[PDB]
Amino acid sequence: MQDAITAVINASDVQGKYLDTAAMEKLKAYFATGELRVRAASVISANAANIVKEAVAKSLLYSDITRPGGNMYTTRRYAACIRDLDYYLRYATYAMLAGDPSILDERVLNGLKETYNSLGVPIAATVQAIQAMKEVTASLVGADAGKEMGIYFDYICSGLS
Amino acid sequence: MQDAITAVINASDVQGKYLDTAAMEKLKAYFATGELRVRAASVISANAANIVKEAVAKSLLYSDITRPGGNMYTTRRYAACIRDLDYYLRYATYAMLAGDPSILDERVLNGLKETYNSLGVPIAATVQAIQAMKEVTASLVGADAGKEMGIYFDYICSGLS
Amino acid sequence: MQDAITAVINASDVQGKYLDTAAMEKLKAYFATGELRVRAASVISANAANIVKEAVAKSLLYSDITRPGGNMYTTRRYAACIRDLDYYLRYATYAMLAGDPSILDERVLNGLKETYNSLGVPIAATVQAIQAMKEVTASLVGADAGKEMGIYFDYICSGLS
Amino acid sequence: SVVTKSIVNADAEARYLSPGELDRIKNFVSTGERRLRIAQTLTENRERIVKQAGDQLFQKRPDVVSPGGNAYGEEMTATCLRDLDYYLRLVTYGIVAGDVTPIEEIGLVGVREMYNSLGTPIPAVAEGIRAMKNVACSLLSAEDAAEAGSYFDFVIGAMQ
Amino acid sequence: SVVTKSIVNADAEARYLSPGELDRIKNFVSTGERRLRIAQTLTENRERIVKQAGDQLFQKRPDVVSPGGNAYGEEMTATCLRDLDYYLRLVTYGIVAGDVTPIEEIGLVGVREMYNSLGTPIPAVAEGIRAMKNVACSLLSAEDAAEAGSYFDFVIGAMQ
Amino acid sequence: SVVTKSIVNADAEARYLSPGELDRIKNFVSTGERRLRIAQTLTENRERIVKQAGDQLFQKRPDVVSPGGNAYGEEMTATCLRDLDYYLRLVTYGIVAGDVTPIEEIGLVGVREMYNSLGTPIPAVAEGIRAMKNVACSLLSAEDAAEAGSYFDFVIGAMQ
Amino acid sequence: SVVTKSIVNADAEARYLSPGELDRIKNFVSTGERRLRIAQTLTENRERIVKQAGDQLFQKRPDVVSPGGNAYGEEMTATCLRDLDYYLRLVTYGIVAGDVTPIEEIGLVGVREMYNSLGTPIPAVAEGIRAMKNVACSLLSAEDAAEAGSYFDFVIGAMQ
Amino acid sequence: SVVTKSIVNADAEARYLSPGELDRIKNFVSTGERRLRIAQTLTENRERIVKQAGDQLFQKRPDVVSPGGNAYGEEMTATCLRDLDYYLRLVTYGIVAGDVTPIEEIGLVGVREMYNSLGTPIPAVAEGIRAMKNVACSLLSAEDAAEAGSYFDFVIGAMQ
């Protein structure tokens, strides 16, 4: 993982240059966003189960996914799907805190598309579900940090696609 | 490829509703702002070479990327970079005219990150170049249509990130 | 006369007490942030003409104010208007270096509202021009210094309105 | 960084960030401006710090710069000074990050292997960084110097 | 007006209007009709006069309208034409007035400061007024050109 | 022309001209007189527009007119201005036609071949046509200037 | 000089300099060696800086070197270089003094009047001064560049 | 190289290398000693070649160093000379390889696109490479210059 601080310093390190004044402006922006980000992370931390519950209701439930032979059918698979949605929520919140999508790329997206295609997981339903999570999360954490959570949720959607 | 007009009618179609008062308000907004969109498209069309030139100068020239052992080194590679920058500009202009980022999604971003990771193209430098184009084209087309363009340029930046 | 350090000294003098730890801490903070304030003030003075040009372009120009009968229609009024913005900036930067908002109230804001009301200057237009200067000055100074400059600029606007 | 440290640990525990860790990153973001100022002064005076501390290193251990030492001749002694410059840069990265994490990656891992194979005496390198720490202390205010002292101290401890 | 200038001088002198001053006021009364006719001609041919003047000024100094120039671009060129039109209207007012009093209060006090702030070239503005003077002489009668040329000339001198 | 372009696309379908296409013909034919007026103004001031464009183009790009450039000497400079005059004639044709097919046919197909064979710099030609656009638009009314800008814009866009 | 400004205040007061004023004199005395070293660098590389800054100024404002510009031709361009050299030497004198007062006395008082009368653009002269400041930043250490940049910036403001 | 071009054609036609292609490779490997000697002289004299040829380029085409030209100013001229150095390096590569494909792959494919973007005039660059060919011919024997000149000729021909 690279957070915004680590990304700035590593970008400067690759060139070999000390932290420039422009890089300092980048770091200052991250520090400015820090309060709203930490507050939103605590909101998601306490309301994580409700976010998954609402999202699975909004999109996944009462569809062909949960009817017999639909892949979310069977209590084992319904449990597995809500587990994966909480994976996405936890890593997306990690990414909101850090400020960089490298957590998503390293810990979620790399290889997930292949495993999902192998297991037969519908990929359109996963994207629709995590977009539904974005709607719920925007409501809970507010628009300003909902702007932020959306960037990382969209990152996951694009990776799965 | 789907405009804002096609998007509005398609959303109403999915809901099986005739175009209602709210969606018709959306359409009225697009029709009203179409004149600004069209004129800005003409401006970018005429000054495409200049926009790419100034962006390549502001962020990419006289640096490691152009010097030997960098990506843009060799005339082959440099010509490819300016070609891709024009592609990002041309599709952004298509998207501004339409009012929807779907053209960018389907035609440009549909694997771009994977292609650049395969060839070794620097994603950060490409993002810098596209943001440089965003600045230059904002100057040329004016602020009013510069904001409308900027959302689609930011879309490409996010996708490549 | 009032400055930040001088005002701490003046309050202590009214008490008659020897320097308190709280007074020492506040004076130490002034000593600590003087470096950033000084560098920004020099930058402001160097780019002072560009700042007022940018401010009138962003707020006070290409409108009815400079069109006939707008209190800037004549060259005399225009010259006085840019001069007034220049004085606003100069005494504001004086005060920003000092660190205390009292200085501007002593000179800039003493009877200024009454004078402008008598002459027919638009109070709101002056306030918006001051805000436009605040944006331009923040851009040139940088966020850390511009935030400090913005507080004292905003105090000037508050006095006007 | 503090943020990365918290997130890595919590990710291993498969747990949304603990409330205390969230408070810790909140304190880090408040303290960030002071960290950036410390990095600003050190990087602005980087040429002074490296130059005079390098003179101190060679004065304290002339055998190291004498003929037969690793920094024997103009070229080799210049590269030794460059290594001192590298470690100052990494210390600035560590100060901004608020944790040793960046310095403990870019350097401080296998430094013993690299230098010992390079032929250099790593205790002498540690003495050079100590000299840089003293110069930085002179250039920093008392409380600010304590934190930068911590990052320099981590470097010299890894060297030893 | 000429009467206004005489009144200002009389007020400073703390004396009733001088007999010669009243005589000039009488001359202004006599020339009111002729001055109004000349002003009507200028207003009637307003668009063509300043159009030709703008072409002449841009020809004389092509950097006003070239890339990197103050009026580079269609919108800024139109604004430059407006500034010239402001001056033309002031000259018509002054011809009616019979004195420099109308122009001096509008476009001849602090004009250098205003133009310096915006960035437009003062010498090029002066040349534009001169081009207007030539066009007006072409479009007016010979003695009408002399009087109109005199008022134009004061404007040009003010720009200097 | 609008008529021939609509007929050609309808011919691809082999359908008789659609009601919308016929309405487009109605609109173009109705506004033809205004188009004639735009072309008339540009051709009436053809000399002034072309020469001013030469002044501005050389001023933006002195290197083309400097010694060792294509437009060195009166004869070479005159040929450059003749090319600008040819393109102004084409622009008037395109305005009257209401489509850019005449401009493309007469002058823009293979222009890169022709100009680099001549040695002339095509980007400099583009700057000259841009100057022609600005000068002509300044002469034209605001409504007329909008359309003429489009016709000039195809030329400059092809030049690039 | 700092001593000169203190002397002016003391002359009006007819009183000995206060402890703070004496501290200012002591600071100038302490940094006298630093000022001399910076002046040594600037004077040593003066000619190279002048030629590099001339190239930068001509690129940024080619109108000055364009036909019809003040510095058109070798003789006029050489005069422009000499004027820039006079400004740079004046900046060196002011830097040695430690205050902008010596530079202000030598020039920049009535400079607007003189340069405008000569016919060279004041903004272009200011741009040349800015190019000189950038070249000095490249050729000097950051701490010395801070003081040198400040005195340069005072010259830029006076030019404005 | 001859070997890679032969393999590429044979690979695209599913053909064990034809006897004629094998003969071409045989001649090329024999001439290797002479090839490497020619390359050694050219790289040893690279400073002289670039300097003299650059003087010739600017003399033949003053517009490129005139204001408004691509190589105006010291830094722009330096980059132009660096490009000439790049092309000489490519020509040495081509001479060693015995084929022009290393030159084509590195620097000749898309050269029009790259230089058109940069604003550089391609025929002027060709003039520079032609001047380099003349200087290299002076530095080489007649038998050597004929072979090396052919590679220079391909570069100018592709960049014509």
Ligand SMILES: *[C@H](C)[C@H]1/C(=C/c2[nH]c(/C=C3N=C(/C=C4\NC(=O)C(CC)=C4C)C(C)=C\3CCC(=O)O)c(CCC(=O)O)c2C)NC(=O)[C@@H]1C
């Ligand atoms: C009834 C005795 C109690 C009760 C239940 C209740 N269940 C639901 C909704 C769902 N139940 C399931 C259950 C299964 N899925 C499976 O694959 C299997 C094993 C084969 C089971 C048992 C599912 C998937 C749903 C979701 C809807 C769907 O089927 O797509 C509801 C509705 C909940 C809601 O508000 O949406 C209810 C009410 N409720 C009671 O009061 C009883 C005590």
Ligand SMILES: *[C@H](C)[C@H]1/C(=C/c2[nH]c(/C=C3N=C(/C=C4\NC(=O)C(CC)=C4C)C(C)=C\3CCC(=O)O)c(CCC(=O)O)c2C)NC(=O)[C@@H]1C
């Ligand atoms: C000199 C003969 C002519 C000229 C050239 C000129 N070129 C540039 C800038 C660049 N040139 C290159 C060229 C190459 N890149 C490559 O990878 C290769 C093959 C290995 C070549 C030949 C590049 C990359 C640049 C960009 C700058 C950079 O290197 O990063 C300039 C500068 C233009 C500018 O303002 O950017 C100039 C002036 N100019 C002349 O007058 C000659 C006719």
Ligand SMILES: *[C@H](C)[C@H]1/C(=C/c2[nH]c(/C=C3N=C(/C=C4\NC(=O)C(CC)=C4C)C(C)=C\3CCC(=O)O)c(CCC(=O)O)c2C)NC(=O)[C@@H]1C
């Ligand atoms: C320019 C900003 C940066 C850069 C890019 C670079 N790209 C390539 C080559 C390719 N680019 C693509 C990309 C696309 N295919 C698409 O369909 C679209 C959207 C319409 C895009 C953007 C592909 C497929 C290639 C490979 C095939 C090809 O060469 O065209 C290169 C060349 C790499 C090579 O090995 O030949 C380069 C250099 N490089 C930079 O330095 C910039 C930061």
Ligand SMILES: CCC1=C(C)/C(=C/C2=NC(=C\c3[nH]c(/C=C4\NC(=O)[C@H](C)[C@H]4CC)c(C)c3CCC(=O)O)/C(CCC(=O)O)=C2C)NC1=O
């Ligand atoms: C009654 C006295 C009076 C006058 C005359 C006046 C004019 C005036 N001219 C302006 C701009 C301008 N004026 C010029 C002038 C010129 N550019 C050129 O190349 C020429 C040499 C020249 C004129 C012939 C330009 C280019 C601008 C626009 C500046 C810009 O936006 O970049 C502006 C600012 C923009 C605006 O209108 O809001 C004013 C107010 N205002 C006044 O109160």
